[PDB]
Design an enzyme around this catalytic site. Structure first.
Site, short mmCIF file in Angstrom:
data_model
loop_
_atom_site.label_atom_id
_atom_site.label_comp_id
_atom_site.label_asym_id
_atom_site.label_seq_id
_atom_site.Cartn_x
_atom_site.Cartn_y
_atom_site.Cartn_z
N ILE A 76 -39.35 20.83 -41.25
CA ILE A 76 -38.04 20.78 -41.88
C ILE A 76 -37.04 20.14 -40.92
O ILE A 76 -36.54 20.78 -40.01
CB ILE A 76 -37.60 22.17 -42.37
N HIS A 77 -36.79 18.86 -41.13
CA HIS A 77 -35.91 18.03 -40.28
C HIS A 77 -35.30 16.93 -41.11
O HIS A 77 -35.69 16.71 -42.26
CB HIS A 77 -36.72 17.32 -39.19
#
Length: 87
Positions: free
Chosen positions: A13-14
């Site tokens: 999650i980026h």
């Protein structure tokens, strides 16, 4: 409300998908948090989210407190799925 997820995205999650996740959270009146590996951050704060460095295969937990907590949880679930992040 609370819900635990498994991160299925190769890139964790980026970047843009994390951004979209934060934006979804920000729509709701509720206070909302994201937790990874014992560290909890305000999900409406992108710096803190990016700081978790959530990788592929992670277990995460999203919590929400407020009048619209259930609706926030459902919208966040939807975003995590649409962005190929988690389930």
């Amino acid at each position: 409300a609370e819900k635990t997820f498994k991160v299925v995205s190769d890139s964790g999650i980026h970047a843009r998908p994390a951004t979209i996740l934060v934006q979804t959270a920000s729509k709701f009146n509720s206070e909302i948090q994201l937790e990874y590996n014992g560290k909890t951050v305000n999900l409406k704060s992108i710096m803190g989210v990016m700081s978790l460095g959530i990788p592929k295969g992670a277990t995460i937990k999203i919590t929400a407190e407020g009048a619209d907590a259930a609706e926030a949880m459902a919208a966040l679930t939807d975003t995590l799925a649409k962005e190929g992040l988690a389930e």
